[PDB]
Structure formats: C-alpha cells, structure tokens
Design a protein around this ligand. Structure first.
Ligand SMILES: [Cu+2]
Ligand SMILES: [Cu+2]
Ligand SMILES: [Cu+2]
Ligand SMILES: [Cu+2]
Ligand SMILES: [Cu+2]
Ligand SMILES: [Cu+2]
Lengths: 332, 328, 328
C-alpha cells in the first residue's frame, strides 16, 4: 500500500531509430529494473505512399510510419517525453497498450501544437504491444494516418520456447502494417488537400467503407523491397515484430515459416510452432521467430494475396548462404 | 435418470447484466428451466434515430445470457406470440444435435416449444435464430445471444488454480446492414417482410452500416456505462454471432482470455486485444488496478468509433502512481 | 542419400475425399511420388449458371489433398499441357526454400517439372499457384489446395494420447470475384487473358461475389453431402488460401481443433467455431453423437447462406434423447 520510491532507480536514455530497424538493446537484461527514457516528436507531414506518387497528410511519431519500436524489459518503467511542435496543426496524444490506466496514457498525454508532456508507466506485462494516437472523436483518423507504432517488453531473461528454453535472435526487424483510406473524387482520382483538417469529412467517408485503398509495410508500397529489402543469412535466427493498430492481418514468409510465433504477442504464453501463416488482430502486435535454412529471395506478406500483391502489404528478404538440396531441389 | 435431478427455474435478466449464479457448482447436475418470449419490434439503433425491425429474444438485443454448469440440462420454453409475423427457432452452439436445436424449435406466431439439451461442454457459446432460408436475416436483425456453461469447479488460470470474478457483464456485439435508397438515406418499412429483398441486398455487400454493443450506438456509455472498482475481478463475456470482432479494454488488458471461449483450454494471458470469430462467444477476465474511465472497444477503430462498437467502464478507487503518472 | 529411400506412388483423389494412407506410419521415411496435371477450364460456380475460367490442379477446385508423414520427401511431377494458355507453378507452405517451390516450378504450356522437398514440419498446409505478378488472380481462380504432413505416430490430443479418425474430408473454401458490367450482370470471357483487367479490378474491392466449398454453391449438398454415422470419428481439413474463414458444424463442435493446422501444438478443445486465417489450412476432429442433417459452414452467416460457404453432413444412427429432446 505504501508508495514505491522511483527516484532510486537508475536511468538510461534511448536513441530511437527508424523502422524496420530497432534501437540498441540486450535480450537478457544486464541490469535490474530501470527507468528507460524516450523522447518522440510528433510530425505532421506529406508522405508518398505508392509508386504512382499518391500523397497523404501523414501524422507521425518521430517522422516515420510506423513510429519507431521502443524496447524495454519487464518491470522497467517507460518514461516518454512527447513533444508536439508549434509547426503542427492538430491535437495529439499517445495510447500504450502495454500500459495500465488513463486509457493507456491517452488521458494524460493530450498535447496541442507548442506543448509537450512526459508520461511514465510501469511495463508490468511482457510482450510486443501497439501504441497509437487516440484523440477523442478523431481516433481512427489519426491511427489510419500512420500515427501508430509498437513497444516490446522483453522478459528479463529473454525469449523462451514452449519448453522454457532460450530463443535468441541474431537480428530483429519491426514491420508496421498500415491500412490507408485515401479519398477519391467523383472521377475516381485520389484527392489532394492543403491541410490535414481540410480532408476530415472525406477521410471519415473513406474510412466508413471499411475498404482500404492501400495496405503497406513501413509506410508505402515497396518500402521493404529492392535496396530496402530485409536481409539475413542461412543459419541466422530472426525475430520479426509485426503490428496492425486498426485492422486484422495474416503474416506469412513465402518459402519459410514462423518457427515460434506469438500471434497475439504476449510472452507469458508459449509460442505456437511451425506456423505457415498467423493472424494478428487489428489493434495487436505479434512476433515471429525463424531460422533461415535456404538462401535466396523470400516474400514476407499479409496472406490475403490481394491485400499483399495489389494493395501493397508485401516485403522482401534477401538471404545469403549455401543452397540445401536435401530440404528442396528440382529433379532433372 | 433426468427425473431424479433437481429442477430450478431461472428468471433471466436483460444484458449487460446476468442472473445470479455460483461459479463453483453448489449442487450436482440439474435441469435448469428458462423461458424466453420472441419479440419483433422497432428499435432505434443510433443517435440519429435510425430504426430497424428488430427480431429479439425476450425483447433485447442481444438476447439475455443464460448461465448453467457443465452437464446440467438446459430446458428452454420458447414462446412466439401471435403478435409477431415470422417463424422463428433457436440454435444453441452449446448443444449437440438437430442443428443446435433449430430443427426441433420451429415456432410460428401463436406457437411455443420446449427444448432440453445437455450442456456437455464448458465455455461461453452463441445461441441464435436460424430459420431455414433466412438465417442471416434473423441473426443480423439482432436475434442472437449467448449461454455460459461453467466448469463445475469454476474458472481456472493457466496453472489450474482458481480464478473468481466479482462481477460479470455480457456484451453482445451486433452487425447491422440497414438498407438505403438511391439518395443514401436509410429506408423505413411497415413490416419486417417488406424489407426482405432490400435486407438481402444490404447484407451481401458484407459492409455493416452499424456495429453496436447491446443493440445501439452508445448503449453502454454515460448512465449505462459498465462499472467496477479498483481491485475488483471482472469477467466480460463477448459474443458476435455473425462477424469477427477484436475486443480491447483501453487502459487495461485481458489478464486471462478464452478468445474462442472454451474453458477446457487454458486461457491466454496478458492480451491487449483478442480475436473472437463470427459465430463465437469469448470471455476475458481482468482485475482493475486504476480508477477512472476505460473504453471497451472492437479494435478495428473505424468499427468502434465510427460504426458504434464501443462502450465505457467507470471505475472507482484510488490512483496508483507506480503504475502510471504524469511526470513532474 | 535419398537414392537409398524406398519410393511409393500415390493416386490422388478428387476432394472432398482424400487418398488412402496410414495415420501411424508403418515404415521409416519414404519418397512419396505425386503427379498433378494443370487444367484451365470453364466452371459453373452457382445455381444461376455463372461461369468463370478456373485454373486448377488436376481439374478440381480445390486441388486434391496430398498426404505424407513428417520427414518423408514429397516429389511432385507438375504437368502443364499445351492445351493451357498461362504460365503456372506451385507454392507449398509445407516446404522450405525458393518461395515454397514457386521459383523452381515455373512451367509454361507444353512443359512439366518435378520438385522434391522434405516435409520437415507436421500439420496441414496450403499449396497454391504463385506466378510472379499474378499471384492473387491465379489463387482466386481456384488454383490452390492443401497437403497434410502427419506426425509419424499419428495425431495426439492435448495429453499426448492418440486421436484416430475413421473418416477424413477435405473442404477447400474459395473466394471468387466475378467481374460485372455496368448493368450489374456477370461478364463472360473467351479466354482467361481477356479478363485480367476486370479481374484485378474486381479483386481490389476485397468483396467476393461468391465464397464456396469444393468449387461451387451447394457443391457439398444432396447426393454430394458429406456422410458419417453416430460414433464415427471424423477429421475435416479446411483450407482458405486467400481469405479468413471461420468453420462451424451446426449441431456439432470441433472436439479437437488445430485452427492454424500445425500438429506440434496441442489442439484447442470443444470449439463451437474457429478462425482459419487466409493462407492457412486447419483441421477439426469430431465424434458424431446424433444422427440427422448437419450444416458445415463459414460462420459469417451471410458468406455461408448468401454467398455459398455452406455444406451438409448426413449422419446415420440412433437419436440420443439424453443429449437433446423436444419436451412433450
Ligand atoms: Cu495524432
Ligand atoms: Cu488501442
Ligand atoms: Cu428469428
Ligand atoms: Cu450458429
Ligand atoms: Cu496458376
Ligand atoms: Cu502462400
């Protein structure tokens, strides 16, 4: 019942990085609980979301869609300084699904242009969680404008398999999947707007159709392909955190599997094994662990193939290494 | 021999509330008697006054939550007053045989029927009308509810230890497809039959015009918000008889969740959001640790804040600065 | 050395039936030989005579279910006759490498190819065509099926105890997007190629015009209804290569279900309904206890009864009044 003295906890500052990459961290905690300090600056900005040059007024956390992945360990405290520069035009806030109370922090972080605030919450549950803006009355508009990301709360002793044995990854990637509803004019062409506010009415209309115009990884069609394809080597253990703050998705690694998967992303639950495809409910973050055994190109996709190959929810993995004819081979 | 079992008559209560019951069974198997009267009635489903011809079990959308224990025999007397105009029946997902009972409970206006079935499997289950050839029309008109079949030794965590809730609420999520004219305005009809054709066309778009909790937009908000106190253990039963949903407690979690609602399976822990497939009932257990307002929503945020799938929790108690605070 | 492994030839069977096999392996690993011939053909998918240019594996929608055991080697000879017009290939979700085999099995009309891969993971998996740049078009044209890789010691329950089925059926669920003209009538094409543009357009609406089992509305009804007898243990393998579905046996349950179909995971028990994500194959085990007609459906009742995702079981045996009965 007595208060816990948090001033005694050591503090560590984190420098966030743009997705799909993840800031420096340790899987197995090397210290006891800490107050981990993060700072994110909200940025309203125009963003090209497809190959035809379609542009929208994106609402971002730190300039990217999705926002950066934050990483802490179970029972650490997350302290976020949220800044809303006066160059922005809208009210924003933040809802951490990893947090307990005040609408995930949303009721304590409402900031208008020119204001800032610092939120602190205890990361009491291990897993990957979604975080997103949630201004009362305009929630889906902000979220579907790209204002969402994720946070991973690692067990202090790292990841474990269904038998309680260590699962250690060599690389980690964060794939934020985004459903966009770009308004179209009477002619069927995407509309343009001077300011975010000007598009509200049309945006609401576009959203209520429940039919996305685009569904992409890392903010745009092909964002995770070509020179920006994810990479790995045969033998490498890779963890892919995947989030969707507003709509269901079903990740799948073409040519591979999800050896160990936490579809709804909570680590106190044993992972599902050998998944071909897994369902991540809208408003959830999930994580899949895989060890590559074949070199070459792999397609990482939302397995509703239309959403993947037509709407944009598809990325690539370029894997190096020696081919395994035992696992698979063309018979002459 | 069923005739040797105790018989008890239950008085059902309107959702989100639930009739009184014991979690850990107090007796052995019993024949639990329920009675529900079918009522076709106009219902306002949104703040704009939109009306539909609702098809209900006991006058509410969703129908009330029935509660029994594993291996009890459910005995339902279903009445279809001659004031209604359609044939109805009932399909219990908790039952075995005759299309969930649908093939044995067909009742035209002015008729009634009594069905009895053994609740052999523990968990929360959906029950809904299913008249041959017009199944989705009735279900999407609000004719569905749920039944909870508790394990005889109560709920258990992933370690087989007891989980006892202090409060329970039943949230029925309903997808509606209200027909519109060429102008785009919702159409009104004199009778349910008049709208069949338009209804079918509206349903086939697979795009709900409304998705609500307890029959209407904002039904579980304001004076009708759900309540709890810091420290209270709350079980929230959630059903969707026709379409997928993804429940989420904003500011909270599903400490223990049976997403597809069957208790022989250990619960999933610490869920932020969970998927309840259409045609399924799920259950989430949570112990409140912070006072204040919480939003309970389908986490497709468009479906929640635009279409109506959102409710509120008003929680009393003292704030916990350790769990969360605005830094000085 | 695979040259050391004995080989066995399998004769595939048209769905919903499955080719014979042993649940518990009677020998060590084997190289199992399969042969499938691709066939592009016009196909009637509804009771109104609507046709489409279907792209099939062995002439059926879905393609046949292949069955092997963990660690066997699957060797498939894929033939693309010069009577076809498009390039095709195959993607095995059960395989490891080269885009599931798609990058190694590309075959134009008049060509064939043989692919071999080790079945390292037990479970039911989807296989489908995946020609670069036209993946969804082929898959939604019916070019997909499934393969089951049984654990060498057969299926086991959540306790490690054996689960042996007396019957097994394979239900392939297909979402079709048939283009329509300005009048709203389904369009007709002389060749698959001529429809591409309209096909892409129709798919991007993400709204299927049809959702069927075994290639057509009512395909699994009447003389083609699935069958069983009271007391029989039945395994129903269900796949959806492109869109989510939620199987449900009306009047029954999924006693043991591997919703996402991977056997190294214990099954979920007593399911009323389960979610099989698009791009996944699932399996449900049930022991019938009541005779009569059952409806096996996708529980989004609109997709089932309006769009076509519904089939029937005809079960023989004695009625059990203890489980269910109409009172006087
Ligand atoms: Cu915002
Ligand atoms: Cu949220
Ligand atoms: Cu009815
Ligand atoms: Cu049902
Ligand atoms: Cu093909
Ligand atoms: Cu695939």
């Amino acid at each position: 019942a007595a208060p816990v003295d948090i001033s005694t906890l050591p503090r560590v500052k984190v420098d966030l990085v743009k997705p799909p990459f993840v800031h420096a961290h340790d899987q197995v905690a090397k210290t006891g609980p800490r107050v981990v300090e993060f700072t994110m600056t909200i940025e309203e900005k125009k963003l090209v979301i497809d190959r035809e040059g379609t542009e929208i007024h994106a609402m971002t956390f730190n300039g990217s869609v999705p926002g950066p992945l934050m990483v802490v360990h179970e029972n650490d405290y997350v302290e976020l300084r949220l800044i809303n520069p006066d160059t922005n035009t809208l009210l924003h806030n933040i809802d951490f699904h990893a947090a307990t109370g005040a609408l995930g922090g949303g009721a304590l972080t409402q900031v208008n242009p020119g204001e800032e605030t610092t939120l602190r919450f205890k990361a009491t549950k291990p897993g990957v969680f979604v975080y997103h803006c949630a201004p009362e009355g305009m929630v889906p508009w902000h979220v579907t404008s790209g204002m969402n990301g994720a946070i991973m709360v690692l067990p202090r002793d790292g990841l474990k398999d269904e038998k309680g044995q260590p699962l250690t990854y060599d690389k980690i990637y964060y794939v934020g999947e985004q459903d966009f509803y770009v308004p179209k004019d009477e002619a069927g062409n995407y509309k343009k707007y001077e300011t975010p506010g000007e598009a509200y009415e049309d945006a609401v209309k576009a959203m209520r159709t429940l039919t996305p115009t685009h569904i992409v990884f890392n903010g745009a069609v092909g964002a995770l392909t070509g020179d920006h394809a994810l990479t790995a080597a045969v033998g490498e253990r890779v963890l892919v955190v995947h989030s969707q703050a507003n709509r269901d998705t079903r990740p799948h690694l073409i040519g591979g599997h999800g050896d160990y998967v936490w579809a709804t992303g909570k680590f106190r639950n044993p992972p599902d094994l050998d998944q071909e495809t897994w369902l991540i409910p809208g408003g959830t973050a999930g994580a899949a662990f895989y060890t590559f055994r074949q070199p070459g190109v792999y397609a990482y996709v939302n397995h509703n193939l239309i959403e993947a190959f037509e709407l944009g929810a598809a990325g690539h993995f370029k894997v190096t290494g020696e081919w395994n004819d035992d696992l698979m081979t063309s018979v002459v």
